[PDB]
Amino acid sequence: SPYLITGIPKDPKHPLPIRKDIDDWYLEQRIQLTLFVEALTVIQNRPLNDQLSYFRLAGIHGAPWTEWDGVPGGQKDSKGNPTGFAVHNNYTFPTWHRVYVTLYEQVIYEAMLDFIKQNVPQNGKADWENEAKQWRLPYWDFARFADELRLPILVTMPMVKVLVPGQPGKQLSKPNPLYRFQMQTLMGTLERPYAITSFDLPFDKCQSTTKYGLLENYNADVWADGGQNWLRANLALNEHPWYQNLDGWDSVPTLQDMTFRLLTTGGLNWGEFSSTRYAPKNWMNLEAIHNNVHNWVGGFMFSRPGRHDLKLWGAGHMSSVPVAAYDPIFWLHHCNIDRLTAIWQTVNSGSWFNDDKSKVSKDDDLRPFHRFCEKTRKVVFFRSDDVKDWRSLNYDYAITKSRIRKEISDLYGQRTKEVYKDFEEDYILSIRYSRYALGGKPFQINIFFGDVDGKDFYDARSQNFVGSVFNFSGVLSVSQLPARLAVHYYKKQNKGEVPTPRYVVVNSQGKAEAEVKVEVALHKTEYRRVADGKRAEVDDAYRA
Amino acid sequence: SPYLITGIPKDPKHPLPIRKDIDDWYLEQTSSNRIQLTLFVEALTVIQNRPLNDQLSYFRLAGIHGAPWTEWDGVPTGFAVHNNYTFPTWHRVYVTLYEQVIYEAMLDFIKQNVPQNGKADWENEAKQWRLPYWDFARFARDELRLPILVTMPMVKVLVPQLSKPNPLYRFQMQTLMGTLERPYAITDLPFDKCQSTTKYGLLENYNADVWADGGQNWLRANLALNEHPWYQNLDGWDSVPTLQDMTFRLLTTGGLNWGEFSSTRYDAPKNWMNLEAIHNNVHNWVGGFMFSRPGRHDLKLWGAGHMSSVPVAAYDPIFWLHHCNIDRLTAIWQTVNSGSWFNDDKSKVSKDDDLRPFHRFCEKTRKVVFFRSDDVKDWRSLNYDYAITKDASRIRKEISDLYGEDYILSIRYSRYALGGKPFQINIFFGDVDGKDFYDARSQNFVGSVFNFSGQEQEGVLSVSQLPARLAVHYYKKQNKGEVPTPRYVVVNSQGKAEAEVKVEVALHKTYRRVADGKRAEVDDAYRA
Ligand SMILES: [O-][O-]
Ligand SMILES: [Cu+2]
Ligand SMILES: [Cu+2]
Ligand SMILES: [Cu+2]
Ligand SMILES: [Cu+2]
């Protein structure tokens, strides 16, 4: 039978339960924690031929590009480009992923019920079923201060203590299914047709998902499980201009600034908000922010030229669209992207596929996700209008359940406001590029104000770095970066002059790509364009 | 009981088998017939899963060294010898104990898992296997590194093929070590809140549940292991890892007596480069000892772990691989200093100390007695060897191949300067950054001395030596030829500077003292 995606079934006793912040949810805890851990462990341990195994569910998103729920799987097109179900660089990006997250949530809920049926004693039946019915997939608030932004506590824990129903007072420390996804062998040697086999990282050599764990110049057996370098990921997540590392300047995490802007800027239409797909004012979009977070969580650079004692590179699944869904944090990230969509919808209530560009895609089938159309009595694919109201999938968020503008400021606008207040003008960077510029491989666009260090053009530790744009998806693509504070620093160092944005396109070997076109400009409001960007050159040894 | 320690029994098919470099061995084993690798993985797994009342469980064998300070083998401060001249010999017997237990567990594994017609092949491999050593001072297969196998969470083994958790990656118990059953509970750093050993995994500003298993930050460990002067960070200067230089010097410098070579104990200065001091820094570099740092930092390079901590270091499986190489360095030095064995007025006293709790049978009396140092002067009597000492005629050239005006830093300190707590003495040439006085990334950093401890015997202090030739050469070039006055900072586990700690630091040149060290002030928020 087709798998009909409904969201968790509606119980009068459980009216629109909320998806909680995963750090809040964990800190308060332990039946729901036990349920989620036990259910997800079962799901991750299902066989490859079980379509509701974790592997096959993550598989929907990308590699290994197989069928799912009876829907033919993908393949490389005539361009040489892998074709799968997930939508990137198009206006259905938020709605495709809305249904995807709901699928995952529903499968977990059903495994929770099966866990209760097999493991909980009569005394505890109804309480445990009650918690299953109130549970919803937690979100990771990547833009909320945990002083700094952080990966969820639970994601950084290799083991988690759970309850043992029937043995009161007894708890067990179990492998945490949110920490990593581990298979029984290297993903490159799975049974056909499931092997993860173009990609520029050795994901065929991984048994487990990893964050920053893949580096060139280590034994290939290290890549089987490169570990969870969550401290490194937290560092990347707190990216900000380089000058803010100097004494006497305050910092603001660029991710939080971007998210505050995304949620509070008015006058965007759906097409502008929903996607990177292409007034530079309106280029700050959901998908661009989501792309940078993918990069910062997983890492995308496998190597770096030269010799470096401190090694800040390292690659991992979340930066790679074909395999990102295997990392258990993928779903928590997309749960928050769904939350951000709901928030924006709530404060932009008429802007639903409302422009001439996105209207073309409004009625796209969101394959492979089935539902029953009661009006025609047929099994059909989800469409974006079916999930316009996320509440018809029987979940909500606290923030979307009157005080939403205040809550946005309180969660994402306090630091920005505090530091900006020290300086009444805004500056932004516009960035436009082609996701195909490097034959489909990912790349990072880094922008600098002032001289670029030809051996160090990578991150917030690089002299004069201002911000990055990550080409996750591998028509054009756009993004936007805050630039106000970095321009102020530059003006201070350079007699008030406005800086020329300088950019470098960095590939997964940490080298600069000279023929990837990027259009970068600096804009000002008391927006007008005030400087045109230029490519910076790097050292000979660092040139692709 | 008693458990008689003998080394692996002699087998005429296996004359004096060598303890191999663990990276070479792992590549031999994987580079399909991985029988020795399977044997070591499976046997150490079984040993790690033995119960606490089994004195041959991993926990109890590690417990000999320090916490939780219980009996072992009927023998009622840990047993481990530190800051004394029996440091190399006590640990020689300890490593042999570990190796023999694993071998016996290998035989058990074969009896349990190998079909009858395969047993001879598998037994042949067990009998050839010896505990591999970690060559912490050899460039790994550009830089020094933790062993390949220590950095792998999972390892593929034969089923007499299958991926299994790697018992060399961590030691994991089923509960937090603070809650174990009396008397075994591990109850400074929150080691009671650990279920697993960790490298750099304990940081203060994170949820305590993170500490249950702080992970294996092996990239950070590798960075520490490659410690060298800050200036070698700059374009386009060449770098030399201090650990490799120290090791080359330890092995090639003639004229030390056993007392000088064997220990940090100080009851001149050119002779303060000793085995125990190098071993101490490696402990720090593998595990990390700083739990916190004051002030605002984007890049967080601190974090603490078991290997930096005397009472719990033996729980980390790399402990044994590190001590295997310390034993190899002893054997190399013995080979090139053959007349120097507890043979000076200082160390002679300690030679007949019983190496408790380790039992052996005396053939002269047919009694069970304790090991003494002279019983293991010849390590081959324990039926193992090292390639480098089995072929001794070339030893000088191999040492050079592997690890190879002079200026040296001398450092004399009390292990109990902070009441027994660990600390790191960092030395600088030039101005010190009052908010960054910690490592190779800190401006003008030259090198560190780690106090591996956790009051000192009257009249007893500790010494170490650091290479300084390249660092002085740089500072003079950059500073109008000025010979640098060494500046020191004594750093505690909170990343703050301990000003009420007196250390004796001095710069010597070919040796004559040419400069006296001074304590560097740091920012107020960074002062202990
Ligand atoms: O979007 O993954
Ligand atoms: Cu996606
Ligand atoms: Cu995504
Ligand atoms: Cu010891
Ligand atoms: Cu030691």
JSON list of C-alpha atoms in Angstrom, two decimals, chain A residues 261-382:
[
{"chain": "A", "resi": 261, "resn": "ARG", "atom": "CA", "xyz": [16.53, 40.37, 9.02]},
{"chain": "A", "resi": 262, "resn": "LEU", "atom": "CA", "xyz": [14.75, 37.49, 7.28]},
{"chain": "A", "resi": 263, "resn": "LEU", "atom": "CA", "xyz": [11.94, 37.49, 9.80]},
{"chain": "A", "resi": 264, "resn": "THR", "atom": "CA", "xyz": [11.53, 41.26, 10.21]},
{"chain": "A", "resi": 265, "resn": "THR", "atom": "CA", "xyz": [12.03, 42.72, 6.73]},
{"chain": "A", "resi": 266, "resn": "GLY", "atom": "CA", "xyz": [8.73, 43.54, 5.09]},
{"chain": "A", "resi": 267, "resn": "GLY", "atom": "CA", "xyz": [7.63, 43.59, 1.49]},
{"chain": "A", "resi": 268, "resn": "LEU", "atom": "CA", "xyz": [9.13, 40.36, 0.21]},
{"chain": "A", "resi": 269, "resn": "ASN", "atom": "CA", "xyz": [6.91, 38.18, -1.97]},
{"chain": "A", "resi": 270, "resn": "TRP", "atom": "CA", "xyz": [6.98, 34.36, -1.63]},
{"chain": "A", "resi": 271, "resn": "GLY", "atom": "CA", "xyz": [9.38, 33.99, -4.54]},
{"chain": "A", "resi": 272, "resn": "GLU", "atom": "CA", "xyz": [11.92, 36.23, -2.87]},
{"chain": "A", "resi": 273, "resn": "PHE", "atom": "CA", "xyz": [11.56, 34.71, 0.60]},
{"chain": "A", "resi": 274, "resn": "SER", "atom": "CA", "xyz": [11.30, 31.04, -0.25]},
{"chain": "A", "resi": 275, "resn": "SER", "atom": "CA", "xyz": [14.38, 30.33, -2.33]},
{"chain": "A", "resi": 276, "resn": "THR", "atom": "CA", "xyz": [17.79, 31.30, -3.64]},
{"chain": "A", "resi": 277, "resn": "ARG", "atom": "CA", "xyz": [16.24, 31.04, -7.12]},
{"chain": "A", "resi": 278, "resn": "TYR", "atom": "CA", "xyz": [16.68, 34.11, -9.29]},
{"chain": "A", "resi": 279, "resn": "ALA", "atom": "CA", "xyz": [16.08, 44.91, -5.47]},
{"chain": "A", "resi": 280, "resn": "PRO", "atom": "CA", "xyz": [18.98, 43.42, -3.54]},
{"chain": "A", "resi": 281, "resn": "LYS", "atom": "CA", "xyz": [17.05, 44.46, -0.44]},
{"chain": "A", "resi": 282, "resn": "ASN", "atom": "CA", "xyz": [14.94, 41.38, -1.06]},
{"chain": "A", "resi": 283, "resn": "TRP", "atom": "CA", "xyz": [17.75, 38.87, -1.60]},
{"chain": "A", "resi": 284, "resn": "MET", "atom": "CA", "xyz": [17.94, 37.80, 2.06]},
{"chain": "A", "resi": 285, "resn": "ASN", "atom": "CA", "xyz": [16.10, 34.48, 1.78]},
{"chain": "A", "resi": 286, "resn": "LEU", "atom": "CA", "xyz": [15.34, 31.34, 3.76]},
{"chain": "A", "resi": 287, "resn": "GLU", "atom": "CA", "xyz": [17.22, 28.94, 1.52]},
{"chain": "A", "resi": 288, "resn": "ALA", "atom": "CA", "xyz": [20.44, 30.99, 1.53]},
{"chain": "A", "resi": 289, "resn": "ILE", "atom": "CA", "xyz": [20.52, 31.02, 5.34]},
{"chain": "A", "resi": 290, "resn": "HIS", "atom": "CA", "xyz": [19.73, 27.30, 5.38]},
{"chain": "A", "resi": 291, "resn": "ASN", "atom": "CA", "xyz": [22.59, 26.67, 2.94]},
{"chain": "A", "resi": 292, "resn": "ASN", "atom": "CA", "xyz": [25.17, 28.38, 5.14]},
{"chain": "A", "resi": 293, "resn": "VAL", "atom": "CA", "xyz": [24.01, 26.41, 8.19]},
{"chain": "A", "resi": 294, "resn": "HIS", "atom": "CA", "xyz": [24.44, 23.15, 6.22]},
{"chain": "A", "resi": 295, "resn": "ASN", "atom": "CA", "xyz": [28.03, 24.16, 5.47]},
{"chain": "A", "resi": 296, "resn": "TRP", "atom": "CA", "xyz": [28.79, 25.29, 9.02]},
{"chain": "A", "resi": 297, "resn": "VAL", "atom": "CA", "xyz": [27.44, 22.09, 10.62]},
{"chain": "A", "resi": 298, "resn": "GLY", "atom": "CA", "xyz": [29.20, 19.60, 8.32]},
{"chain": "A", "resi": 299, "resn": "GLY", "atom": "CA", "xyz": [32.22, 21.35, 6.84]},
{"chain": "A", "resi": 300, "resn": "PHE", "atom": "CA", "xyz": [32.93, 21.13, 3.10]},
{"chain": "A", "resi": 301, "resn": "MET", "atom": "CA", "xyz": [36.72, 21.47, 2.65]},
{"chain": "A", "resi": 302, "resn": "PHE", "atom": "CA", "xyz": [38.61, 18.16, 2.50]},
{"chain": "A", "resi": 303, "resn": "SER", "atom": "CA", "xyz": [42.03, 19.74, 2.21]},
{"chain": "A", "resi": 304, "resn": "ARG", "atom": "CA", "xyz": [44.08, 22.95, 2.20]},
{"chain": "A", "resi": 305, "resn": "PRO", "atom": "CA", "xyz": [47.26, 23.79, 0.27]},
{"chain": "A", "resi": 306, "resn": "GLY", "atom": "CA", "xyz": [50.45, 24.30, 2.23]},
{"chain": "A", "resi": 307, "resn": "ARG", "atom": "CA", "xyz": [51.34, 23.18, 5.71]},
{"chain": "A", "resi": 308, "resn": "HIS", "atom": "CA", "xyz": [49.18, 24.19, 8.68]},
{"chain": "A", "resi": 309, "resn": "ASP", "atom": "CA", "xyz": [49.49, 23.05, 12.29]},
{"chain": "A", "resi": 310, "resn": "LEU", "atom": "CA", "xyz": [46.02, 24.20, 13.23]},
{"chain": "A", "resi": 311, "resn": "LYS", "atom": "CA", "xyz": [43.68, 22.54, 10.77]},
{"chain": "A", "resi": 312, "resn": "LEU", "atom": "CA", "xyz": [40.35, 24.31, 10.49]},
{"chain": "A", "resi": 313, "resn": "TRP", "atom": "CA", "xyz": [39.16, 22.39, 7.45]},
{"chain": "A", "resi": 314, "resn": "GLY", "atom": "CA", "xyz": [37.40, 19.03, 7.43]},
{"chain": "A", "resi": 315, "resn": "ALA", "atom": "CA", "xyz": [34.31, 17.81, 5.64]},
{"chain": "A", "resi": 316, "resn": "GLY", "atom": "CA", "xyz": [31.12, 16.05, 6.60]},
{"chain": "A", "resi": 317, "resn": "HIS", "atom": "CA", "xyz": [27.70, 15.00, 5.42]},
{"chain": "A", "resi": 318, "resn": "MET", "atom": "CA", "xyz": [25.68, 18.09, 6.22]},
{"chain": "A", "resi": 319, "resn": "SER", "atom": "CA", "xyz": [27.55, 20.24, 3.70]},
{"chain": "A", "resi": 320, "resn": "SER", "atom": "CA", "xyz": [26.74, 17.81, 0.87]},
{"chain": "A", "resi": 321, "resn": "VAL", "atom": "CA", "xyz": [23.26, 17.86, -0.63]},
{"chain": "A", "resi": 322, "resn": "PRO", "atom": "CA", "xyz": [23.34, 14.23, -1.83]},
{"chain": "A", "resi": 323, "resn": "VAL", "atom": "CA", "xyz": [24.06, 12.86, 1.65]},
{"chain": "A", "resi": 324, "resn": "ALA", "atom": "CA", "xyz": [23.08, 15.58, 4.15]},
{"chain": "A", "resi": 325, "resn": "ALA", "atom": "CA", "xyz": [19.84, 13.85, 5.11]},
{"chain": "A", "resi": 326, "resn": "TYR", "atom": "CA", "xyz": [21.80, 10.97, 6.68]},
{"chain": "A", "resi": 327, "resn": "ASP", "atom": "CA", "xyz": [22.97, 13.23, 9.54]},
{"chain": "A", "resi": 328, "resn": "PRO", "atom": "CA", "xyz": [20.29, 13.12, 12.29]},
{"chain": "A", "resi": 329, "resn": "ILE", "atom": "CA", "xyz": [20.70, 16.89, 12.76]},
{"chain": "A", "resi": 330, "resn": "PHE", "atom": "CA", "xyz": [19.42, 17.38, 9.20]},
{"chain": "A", "resi": 331, "resn": "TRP", "atom": "CA", "xyz": [15.85, 16.83, 10.39]},
{"chain": "A", "resi": 332, "resn": "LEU", "atom": "CA", "xyz": [16.22, 19.21, 13.36]},
{"chain": "A", "resi": 333, "resn": "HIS", "atom": "CA", "xyz": [17.66, 21.86, 11.08]},
{"chain": "A", "resi": 334, "resn": "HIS", "atom": "CA", "xyz": [14.78, 21.46, 8.62]},
{"chain": "A", "resi": 335, "resn": "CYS", "atom": "CA", "xyz": [12.33, 21.46, 11.50]},
{"chain": "A", "resi": 336, "resn": "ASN", "atom": "CA", "xyz": [13.57, 24.96, 12.29]},
{"chain": "A", "resi": 337, "resn": "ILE", "atom": "CA", "xyz": [13.49, 25.96, 8.59]},
{"chain": "A", "resi": 338, "resn": "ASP", "atom": "CA", "xyz": [9.85, 24.92, 8.69]},
{"chain": "A", "resi": 339, "resn": "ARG", "atom": "CA", "xyz": [9.37, 27.02, 11.84]},
{"chain": "A", "resi": 340, "resn": "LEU", "atom": "CA", "xyz": [11.00, 30.02, 10.16]},
{"chain": "A", "resi": 341, "resn": "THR", "atom": "CA", "xyz": [8.65, 29.54, 7.20]},
{"chain": "A", "resi": 342, "resn": "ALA", "atom": "CA", "xyz": [5.65, 29.46, 9.56]},
{"chain": "A", "resi": 343, "resn": "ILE", "atom": "CA", "xyz": [6.85, 32.56, 11.36]},
{"chain": "A", "resi": 344, "resn": "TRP", "atom": "CA", "xyz": [7.34, 34.47, 8.11]},
{"chain": "A", "resi": 345, "resn": "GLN", "atom": "CA", "xyz": [3.96, 33.31, 6.82]},
{"chain": "A", "resi": 346, "resn": "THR", "atom": "CA", "xyz": [2.31, 34.56, 9.99]},
{"chain": "A", "resi": 347, "resn": "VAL", "atom": "CA", "xyz": [3.73, 38.05, 9.53]},
{"chain": "A", "resi": 348, "resn": "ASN", "atom": "CA", "xyz": [3.30, 38.01, 5.75]},
{"chain": "A", "resi": 349, "resn": "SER", "atom": "CA", "xyz": [-0.11, 36.40, 5.61]},
{"chain": "A", "resi": 350, "resn": "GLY", "atom": "CA", "xyz": [-0.94, 37.20, 1.98]},
{"chain": "A", "resi": 351, "resn": "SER", "atom": "CA", "xyz": [2.41, 36.26, 0.48]},
{"chain": "A", "resi": 352, "resn": "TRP", "atom": "CA", "xyz": [1.86, 32.65, -0.49]},
{"chain": "A", "resi": 353, "resn": "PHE", "atom": "CA", "xyz": [3.14, 31.76, -3.97]},
{"chain": "A", "resi": 354, "resn": "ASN", "atom": "CA", "xyz": [1.91, 35.25, -4.77]},
{"chain": "A", "resi": 355, "resn": "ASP", "atom": "CA", "xyz": [4.36, 36.35, -7.50]},
{"chain": "A", "resi": 356, "resn": "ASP", "atom": "CA", "xyz": [4.45, 35.60, -11.22]},
{"chain": "A", "resi": 357, "resn": "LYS", "atom": "CA", "xyz": [7.57, 33.48, -10.79]},
{"chain": "A", "resi": 358, "resn": "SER", "atom": "CA", "xyz": [6.56, 31.17, -7.94]},
{"chain": "A", "resi": 359, "resn": "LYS", "atom": "CA", "xyz": [2.95, 30.81, -9.18]},
{"chain": "A", "resi": 360, "resn": "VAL", "atom": "CA", "xyz": [4.31, 28.61, -11.96]},
{"chain": "A", "resi": 361, "resn": "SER", "atom": "CA", "xyz": [5.46, 26.05, -9.39]},
{"chain": "A", "resi": 362, "resn": "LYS", "atom": "CA", "xyz": [2.61, 26.31, -6.91]},
{"chain": "A", "resi": 363, "resn": "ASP", "atom": "CA", "xyz": [0.86, 23.25, -8.31]},
{"chain": "A", "resi": 364, "resn": "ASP", "atom": "CA", "xyz": [3.98, 21.08, -8.61]},
{"chain": "A", "resi": 365, "resn": "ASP", "atom": "CA", "xyz": [3.60, 17.56, -7.26]},
{"chain": "A", "resi": 366, "resn": "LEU", "atom": "CA", "xyz": [5.79, 17.17, -4.16]},
{"chain": "A", "resi": 367, "resn": "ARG", "atom": "CA", "xyz": [7.00, 13.68, -5.06]},
{"chain": "A", "resi": 368, "resn": "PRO", "atom": "CA", "xyz": [7.34, 11.12, -3.70]},
{"chain": "A", "resi": 369, "resn": "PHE", "atom": "CA", "xyz": [4.89, 12.06, -0.92]},
{"chain": "A", "resi": 370, "resn": "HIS", "atom": "CA", "xyz": [1.44, 10.50, -1.16]},
{"chain": "A", "resi": 371, "resn": "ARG", "atom": "CA", "xyz": [-1.86, 11.53, 0.35]},
{"chain": "A", "resi": 372, "resn": "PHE", "atom": "CA", "xyz": [-5.51, 10.71, -0.16]},
{"chain": "A", "resi": 373, "resn": "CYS", "atom": "CA", "xyz": [-7.63, 13.32, -1.96]},
{"chain": "A", "resi": 374, "resn": "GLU", "atom": "CA", "xyz": [-11.04, 12.83, -0.41]},
{"chain": "A", "resi": 375, "resn": "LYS", "atom": "CA", "xyz": [-12.66, 15.09, -3.01]},
{"chain": "A", "resi": 376, "resn": "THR", "atom": "CA", "xyz": [-11.66, 12.76, -5.85]},
{"chain": "A", "resi": 377, "resn": "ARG", "atom": "CA", "xyz": [-11.16, 9.57, -3.85]},
{"chain": "A", "resi": 378, "resn": "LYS", "atom": "CA", "xyz": [-7.68, 9.07, -5.25]},
{"chain": "A", "resi": 379, "resn": "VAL", "atom": "CA", "xyz": [-4.17, 8.73, -3.93]},
{"chain": "A", "resi": 380, "resn": "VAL", "atom": "CA", "xyz": [-2.26, 11.76, -5.19]},
{"chain": "A", "resi": 381, "resn": "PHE", "atom": "CA", "xyz": [0.94, 13.62, -4.41]},
{"chain": "A", "resi": 382, "resn": "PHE", "atom": "CA", "xyz": [1.07, 16.41, -1.90]}
]
